[PDB]
Scaffold this active site. Structure first.
Site, mmCIF file in Angstrom:
data_model
loop_
_atom_site.group_PDB
_atom_site.id
_atom_site.type_symbol
_atom_site.label_atom_id
_atom_site.label_comp_id
_atom_site.label_asym_id
_atom_site.label_seq_id
_atom_site.Cartn_x
_atom_site.Cartn_y
_atom_site.Cartn_z
ATOM 1 N N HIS A 108 0.716 -1.240 -0.097
ATOM 2 C CA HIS A 108 -0.101 -0.104 0.073
ATOM 3 C C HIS A 108 0.798 1.225 0.113
ATOM 4 O O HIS A 108 1.884 1.211 0.964
ATOM 5 C CB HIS A 108 -0.956 0.081 1.255
ATOM 6 N N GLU A 173 8.824 0.673 -2.508
ATOM 7 C CA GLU A 173 7.729 -0.431 -2.430
ATOM 8 C C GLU A 173 8.650 -1.840 -2.844
ATOM 9 O O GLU A 173 8.549 -2.808 -2.536
ATOM 10 C CB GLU A 173 6.445 -0.270 -3.602
#
Ligand SMILES: Nc1nc2[nH]c(CCCc3cc(C(=O)N[C@@H](CCC(=O)O)C(=O)O)cs3)cc2c(=O)[nH]1
Ligand SMILES: NCC(=O)N[C@@H]1O[C@H](COP(=O)([O-])[O-])[C@@H](O)[C@H]1O
Length: 200
Positions: A108, A173
């Site tokens: 996320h 990420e």
């Protein structure tokens, strides 16, 4: 551990997971890539890496439970141990999440619990934070509320847009999702019986 990666789009997180899981000391192998959308770039990346793909179109199903059941059938077909949601944009049903409890990870693009939902960068920019980031968490029924495994902070620069901020956050990420997958696949991190993260 046998891993499925679920995608809906570009697949940069998928590519970082492919790269990491092919390193000799990887405790994880990616055995199937599932997209809910046809003709996305992530499918090309999987094919180029020689990983099987399936497209399961959510639009063809009457409700979430039937769609999730179709996913689950493929997961069983490939004897999957761990599921990674990597740009997958569907909310999953309760029973599917429960079945895969402690085995399913999501990336996320915010520092949870801030900016839950599908437009985290828009929210971060509207709010005016100068530090955002990304989170890998175990998937629980409540969206973006499951147990946090790893996070990495990323600065917001003045004048940032979703385009420039998302680009910067994706670099992070691509570090924490492979690291989190290795922690779970090696058994180093698990979801505890008390529902809290356990580092063994
Ligand atoms: N139970 C559960 N499901 C999950 N799915 C994802 C991964 C996705 C997280 C998110 C999806 C949406 C959303 O609104 N999805 C819409 C479709 C959006 C679109 O069309 O692009 C929907 O599913 O109806 C907002 S955040 C994470 C996560 C979770 O923690 N819990
Ligand atoms: N609600 C989840 C969410 O917003 N996911 C985000 O979608 C992007 C997918 O990029 P990718 O397809 O290049 O991996 C990533 O930024 C991921 O964190």
């Amino acid at each position: 551990a046998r891993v499925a990666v679920l995608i809906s789009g570009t697949g940069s997180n998928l590519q970082a997971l492919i790269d990491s899981t092919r390193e000799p000391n990887s405790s994880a192998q990616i055995d199937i890539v599932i997209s809910n959308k046809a003709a996305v770039a992530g499918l090309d990346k999987a094919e180029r890496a020689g990983i099987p793909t399936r497209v399961i179109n959510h639009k063809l199903y009457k409700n979430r439970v039937e769609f999730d059941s179709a996913i689950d059938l493929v997961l069983e077909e490939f004897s999957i141990d761990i599921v990674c949601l990597a740009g997958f944009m569907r909310i999953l049903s309760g029973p599917f999440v429960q079945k895969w409890n402690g085995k399913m990870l999501n990336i996320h693009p915010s520092l949870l619990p801030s900016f839950k939902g599908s437009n985290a960068h828009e929210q971060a920019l509207e709010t005016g934070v100068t530090v955002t980031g990304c989170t890998v968490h175990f998937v629980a029924e409540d969206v973006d509320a499951g147990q946090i495994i790893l996070q990495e902070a990323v600065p917001v620069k003045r004048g940032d847009t979703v385009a420039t901020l998302s680009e910067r956050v994706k670099l992070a990420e691509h570090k924490i999702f492979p690291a989190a997958l290795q922690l779970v696949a090696s058994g180093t991190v698990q979801l505890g019986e008390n529902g809290k993260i356990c580092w063994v």
